[PDB]
Every structure is written in structure tokens, then in C-alpha cells.
Amino acid sequence: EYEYLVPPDDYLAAGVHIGTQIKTGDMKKFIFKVRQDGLYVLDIRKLDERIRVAAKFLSRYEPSKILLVAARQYAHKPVQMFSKVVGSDYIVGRFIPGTLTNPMLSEYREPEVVFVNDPAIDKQAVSEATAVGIPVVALCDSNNSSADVDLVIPTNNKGRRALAIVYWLLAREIAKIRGQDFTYSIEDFEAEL
Amino acid sequence: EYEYLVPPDDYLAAGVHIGTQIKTGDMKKFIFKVRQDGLYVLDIRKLDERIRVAAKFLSRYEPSKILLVAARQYAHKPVQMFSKVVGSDYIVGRFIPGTLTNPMLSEYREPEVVFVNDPAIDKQAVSEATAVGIPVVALCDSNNSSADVDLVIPTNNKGRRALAIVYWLLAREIAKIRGQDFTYSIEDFEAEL
Ligand code: NA
Ligand code: NA
Ligand code: NA
Ligand code: NA
Ligand code: NA
Numbered sequence: 001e002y003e004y005l006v007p008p009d010d011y012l013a014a015g016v017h018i019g020t021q022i023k024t025g026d027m028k029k030f031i032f033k034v035r036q037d038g039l040y041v042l043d044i045r046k047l048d049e050r051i052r053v054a055a056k057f058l059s060r061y062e063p064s065k066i067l068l069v070a071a072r073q074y075a076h077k078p079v080q081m082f083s084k085v086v087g088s089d090y091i092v093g094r095f096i097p098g099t100l101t102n103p104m105l106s107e108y109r110e111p112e113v114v115f116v117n118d119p120a121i122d123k124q125a126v127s128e129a130t131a132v133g134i135p136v137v138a139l140c141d142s143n144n145s146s147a148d149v150d151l152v153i154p155t156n157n158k159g160r161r162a163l164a165i166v167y168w169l170l171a172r173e174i175a176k177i178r179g180q181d182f183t184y185s186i187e188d189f190e191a192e193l
Numbered sequence: 194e195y196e197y198l199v200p201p202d203d204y205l206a207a208g209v210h211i212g213t214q215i216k217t218g219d220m221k222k223f224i225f226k227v228r229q230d231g232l233y234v235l236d237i238r239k240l241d242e243r244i245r246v247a248a249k250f251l252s253r254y255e256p257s258k259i260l261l262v263a264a265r266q267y268a269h270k271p272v273q274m275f276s277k278v279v280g281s282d283y284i285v286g287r288f289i290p291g292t293l294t295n296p297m298l299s300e301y302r303e304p305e306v307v308f309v310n311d312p313a314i315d316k317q318a319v320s321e322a323t324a325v326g327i328p329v330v331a332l333c334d335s336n337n338s339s340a341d342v343d344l345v346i347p348t349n350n351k352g353r354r355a356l357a358i359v360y361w362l363l364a365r366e367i368a369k370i371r372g373q374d375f376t377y378s379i380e381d382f383e384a385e386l
Contacts, residue, residue: 024218025217025218025219025220025221025222026218026219026221026222027218028218028219028338029218029219029338029339029340030340043340046340049323049326050343052326053326053328053343056326056328057250057328057343060250060253060254061253130242133242133245133246133249135246135249135250145221145222146222147222147223147236147239150243150246150344151343151344
């Protein structure tokens with residue numbers, strides 16, 4: 001029996017397994033099945049394994065050197081709350097071109113690892129981080145595919161609740177490794193509306 | 194404008210870009226093109242970027258906590274030479290089931306990261322590492338596909354010289370990150386005839 005970070009039903013209730021109508025070759029290994037309504041379903045066993053791995057991966061960096069990126073609206077709150085807990089830097093909303101490549105921009109930063117919400121939406125950040133040799137972690141849905149993403153977290157990266165539980169779990173596990181008290185609830189990470 | 198770790202011609206002479214007659218969905222994003230003879234060609238730009246990232250990541254671990262695994266014969270020497278330089282542990286030849294999951298087994302170890310030569314050949318190690326939450330790094334050829342590999346290094350992982358230059362580069366970059374002198378030639382890493 002596999003031991004999940006949370007009861008399996010919690011993952012399903014959050015809709016992390018709900019993909020899109022599109023499947024990429026890169027994501028096939030994470031797709032459990034395709035629903036009759038054409039929607040692809042992600043493997044929660046794989047998601048759980050990847051969240052654990054990502055938490056360990058990220059705990060190998062000093063907090064301030066971690067940069068989270070997310071233009072997608074429902075990801076802003078989860079990203080900011082994750083940062084509140086982990087101590088990572090973040091950029092939500094429009095990512096300004098040159099933020100990682102132009103030392104003269106006021107927004108310029110030099111993180112050692114970049115974590116984006118969606119490689120398609122946050123493509124500018126992914127491309128720049130890769131051009132500068134910075135490892136890229138990313139949430140990838142069935143429709144995503146990027147040769148520039150180094151560490152993948154296969155999950156619904158669009159749903160309000162799905163994003164809340166994933167960022168919440170990542171922050172929770174990183175805090176555990178760090179021996180930092182964490183009492184936040186999934187609701188605390190969830191975007192309004 | 195990209196800057197390779199070594200003259201591009203060196204990568205080609207080693208045949209790292211030469212894949213097999215098969216292409217998985219997992220590897221599609223790394224395939225540059227398909228040759229006249231049916232052989233898929235890997236993207237050396239991505240390989241170079243990935244070797245750089247893997248070296249950085251691995252240098253984030255106490256060397257003794259890194260475990261290299263390789264049953265494939267042409268990978269033994271490269272793996273042993275990499276370990277000589279890096280200080281990592283390794284298991285070449287048959288990987289005994291239970292090595293990462295059975296504490297009573299004499300060969301039992303608790304590495305913090307596992308790096309295998311081929312996820313199909315070294316599937317036992319990949320499966321066990323994943324089952325215990327240990328991040329998995331792997332060399333993946335066009336024919337490979339594994340949801341259990343966390344960090345991928347897209348390259349020919351069968352060729353004698355292909356393996357020598359890849360392990361050589363990784364070791365060189367890790368030593369460089371440490372400052373450790375590195376005077377080995379690619380030949381010093383190549384399996385004998
Ligand atoms: Na989705
Ligand atoms: Na990248
Ligand atoms: Na707690
Ligand atoms: Na090959
Ligand atoms: Na794994």
C-alpha cells in the first residue's frame with residue numbers, strides 16, 4: 001500500500017487529477033487514463049511522489065535563492081503563502097523580460113532555482129532561467145510540454161483548489177524538513193472567489 | 194550564441210546525439226530530428242544544459258550520499274572513474290533487489306540521491322529509489338521512458354564513448370564546482386575493448 005501525504009480523497013476532492021482535453025508526449029507517463037468526456041486524468045501516486053521529491057529538491061537551497069513565478073491568477077495567493085512559509089522570493093502577474101538576464105533592471109534577481117506555475121504561461125521565466133543555467137521546477141498539466149523544465153510536478157495547474165493544496169503541501173513538507181512549525185490549512189493558501 | 198562545455202565537435206565525435214530507431218513520448222522534446230536511416234538525433238544543446246544542471250544539483254549533496262548505478266557493461270568504467278573523482282558510492286553489475294529497501298540485506302544503503310545509467314536496464318534501482326523517496330537522476334536515450342526518473346540527462350546511453358564523455362563532463366563540472374583539480378582525459382573514462 002502506498003502512503004500519500006494526505007488522504008487520497010483529499011487530492012481528488014481538490015481536483016489535482018483533472019487534466020485537460022489535450023495530452024502531450026511528455027505527459028503521457030503521468031496520465032492514468034482518459035475520461036469519456038475527453039478529459040485526461042493524472043496519476044495521483046506520481047503527483048505525491050513528485051511533491052515529496054520537489055520538497056527535498058528545494059530544501060537543498062537557501063530560501064532567498066528560490067524564486068517562484070506565476071502569472072496565472074489562481075496561483076498568486078498559493079505562491080505568496082508558500083513564500084511566506086518558505087522564505088522564497090516570488091514574482092506574480094506579468095514577468096518582465098530581462099528579469100533574470102538584465103543585471104540593470106530594478107527587477108533583476110539571481111536565484112539558484114526557479115519554480116513556475118505553468119511552463120506555457122510563465123514561458124518567459126522558464127526560457128530566461130534556462131538561458132542562465134538556473135534549474136527550473138514546474139507544475140505541469142496534461143497539455144504542458146517543455147524541454148526547459150528540469151523537475152516536473154504533474155498536476156492540474158489551473159484549478160483554484162488544486163493549486164492551493166499543491167503549494168500548501170510543498171510548503172508543509174519543506175517546513176517539516178527544516179523543523180519549522182507549520183499550522184496553515186489548505187484554505188489559507190486558496191485564492192479568493 | 195550558446196556556449197558548450199566542450200567544442201561541439203567533441204560531442205558529435207562521441208556520438209552522444211545518436212539515439213535509436215525508437216522514440217518515446219517522454220523523449221520527443223529532446224529529439225532534434227530523425228535521420229535518413231531511421232535513427233533519432235538528440236538535441237546536444239539540451240544535453241549540454243542538462244549536464245550543467247545535473248552537476249550543480251549533485252554538488253548539493255555530500256558525495257558519499259550519492260549512489261551511481263549501472264548494469265550496462267560500457268558504463269562500469271565511466272561510473273567507477275566518476276566515483277573516483279566525485280567520491281560517490283556506486284553499484285555496477287547486477288543490482289540486488291532489496292539494496293535500497295531491505296535493511297537486513299548486507300548491500301543495503303541509504304543514499305540521498307541515485308543516478309542510474311539507463312532506467313530500463315537499471316529499473317530495479319529506479320523502482321526502489323522511488324519507493325523510498327530518493328530522487329532519481331538518469332541518462333535517457335530516445336527509447337527510454339520512465340515516470341520514475343526525476344532529473345533527465347538526454348543522451349545516447351549505450352555507446353562506449355558517449356558514456357565516457359558524459360560521465361567525464363559531469364565529474365569535471367562537479368570537481369570544478371569544488372575547485373578540485375581535474376586532469377583526466379575522456380579516454381581515461383572509456384571502457385576497455
Ligand atoms: Na487541468
Ligand atoms: Na531549464
Ligand atoms: Na504542523
Ligand atoms: Na543510442
Ligand atoms: Na523517482
